[PDB]
Paper text:
The Lactobacillus S-layers are anchored to the cell wall through interaction with teichoic acids (TA), either lipoteichoic acid (LTA) or wall teichoic acid (WTA).
The N-terminal part, exhibiting the first two domains (SlpA_I and SlpA_II), is known to be responsible for the self-assembly of the S-layer protein into a regular lattice. One basic tile is composed of the homodimer of the full-length SlpA, dimerized at the SlpA_II domain. The self-assembly region (SA) is formed by domains SlpA_I and SlpA_II, building a 2D crystalline network that forms the exposed surface of the SlpA layer.
Author numbering:
A (entry chain A), B (entry chain A): 213 to 260, 265 to 309, 314 to 326
């Protein structure tokens, strides 16, 4: 009964996607900018009586997801970007996940 | 210089996908069957002199990825399935990741 939607237009989604640019000199991304891009684009709710549902994923959850995928993240949150990688957003009222695939211009 | 390909036809890929069916009574999936489905479909290599590259993700890596996405996995590897979720396969010669989105018939 928890579903995700695109903020800009209100359409329900069951997968997500992001286009990002890495730093032009170091070719790095920061974990906190990936999470903020995701939460600027997607949100969650419960349908009717209907209400917003909190997205529980925080910056250390995302750091741990990436670390277990073989990606190395330094103490500042920076990591060398891949052309393609993914992570899950979680929401809890009833739990639900939104898989997000990221493409990086590098 | 590491790339992934579909085993059945040899086409290079930069994202992956899987269709799975959960257990008809419990609605559960096991982590080890998800990983075996992924490795039956996708592999990695380095292009020329060319050679196969090992996929390093094992069953405890995948368990830790899912746990950090809010999904609960019991000591036997079983978890209640979502309609949509994702994980990353890693390969190391030069590192590379393949994001895989799973859809579940439930």
């Amino acid at each position: 009964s928890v579903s995700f939607y695109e903020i800009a237009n209100g359409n329900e989604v069951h997968t997500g996607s992001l286009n990002m640019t890495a730093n032009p000199t170091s070719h790095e991304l920061n974990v906190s900018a990936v999470l903020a891009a995701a939460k600027a684009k997607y949100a969650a709710h419960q349908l009717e009586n209907g209400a917003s549902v909190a997205v529980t994923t925080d910056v250390k959850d995302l750091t741990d997801q990436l670390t277990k995928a073989g990606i190395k993240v330094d103490p500042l949150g920076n990591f060398q970007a891949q052309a393609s990688f993914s992570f899950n957003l979680a929401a809890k009222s009833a739990t639900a996940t939104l898989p997000i695939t990221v493409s990086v211009a590098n």
